[PDB]
Amino acid sequence: IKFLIRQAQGLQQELGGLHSALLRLLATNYPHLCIVDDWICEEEITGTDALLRRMLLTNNAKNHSPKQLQEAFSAVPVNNTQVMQIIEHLTLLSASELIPYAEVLTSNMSQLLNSGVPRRILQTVNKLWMVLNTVMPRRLWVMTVNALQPSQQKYTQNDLMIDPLIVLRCDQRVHRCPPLMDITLHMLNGYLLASKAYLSAHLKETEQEVTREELKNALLAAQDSAAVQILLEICLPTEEEKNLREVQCLICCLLHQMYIADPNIAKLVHFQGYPCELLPLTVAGIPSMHICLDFIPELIAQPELEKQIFAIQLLSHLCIQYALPKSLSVARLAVNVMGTLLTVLTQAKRYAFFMPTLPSLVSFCRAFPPLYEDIMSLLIQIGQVCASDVATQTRDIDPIITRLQGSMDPDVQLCHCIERTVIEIINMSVSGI
């Protein structure tokens, strides 16, 4: 279908209304076909360097064959250079002749995943995969997924529209190799739109109800939201390091496109909450994030303690990045909210709420030196109330004696956190001109 649509795109002038009708029908029923990035990659350049390069190197290039590629690529740890030779000539090949080469590359990406290969070979494979994506996308997706399953049941097209997180069921080696991760991202985005279309068709078929449309909306929303969550967990650094930057860049790009397509999903992802280690790098990466200041009051007003903590930390890093008067009003609201929770919270949850949100206060104070005396008043109030708790029940390390300057008691840890954040505010303000 995609290749014929491209040919109709070429021969628009002869065909009267057929190109219109077909492009309307694909935009009605096959959005994962009519995604935009593949089409712009089709539009390419009219610098004609590809055409001249093809016309002056394809010639008689000693008849490279899929079986020869298979032999050299099965003996690839003995011979990488012949493989890279062959796929160089394959990138020189055109879009139509590439089809008999679809079997080999996909089904044998496992030794590519093995460490030690050069990413010139990897990027050559990536560019060939883009070209096969603009020619024959659907079988390409099927072979790619069924060959990227970890080291083996064989998924089908209908199963992939049913459950596209199977695309994310792949190697942690896939997760930490950059360009194959880009291939995975394309398949993920495509199959999400495909799942929307397929649930659409299945509900319209099964009618032989209003709860059914709402169930469709709920399932799709939770669906792409869970996909986003898996992607962010991929962005989390593993315990082993304790490539990653490029992987985080690719996932930030895909999240950017999803957020632009639907800002409801930003709302739902932020209400669900994700690791705050992921929070600052995602803040730096995703540019279409500053819609968050629309709903940060709602996430503050949510009754869950974990959600209120997450909202305050998100607001902190937003106010580091963009300093808007809108963000300043939201910050003032957050500070008064924090005062209110200080008025109403018992001591165990006081520890569990006020340990994580203090670097948010130093973020506020970095953003807005007008919003400064309120911060200091709240800091002194939370301080002396925690010191009064330390006084109430007997302790050992005695911050009252420590005044003139592990796993301990909670109020001890809270007082230490408070004085550390005061130290950070002061050092910040001294060095910050």
């Binding site: 909306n217 709302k267 709602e298 949510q302």
Partner: peptide, 8 residues
């Protein structure tokens, strides 16, 4: 058509 938490 659900834009927020249901009780609030």
């Amino acid at each position: 058509t659900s834009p927020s938490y249901s009780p609030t």
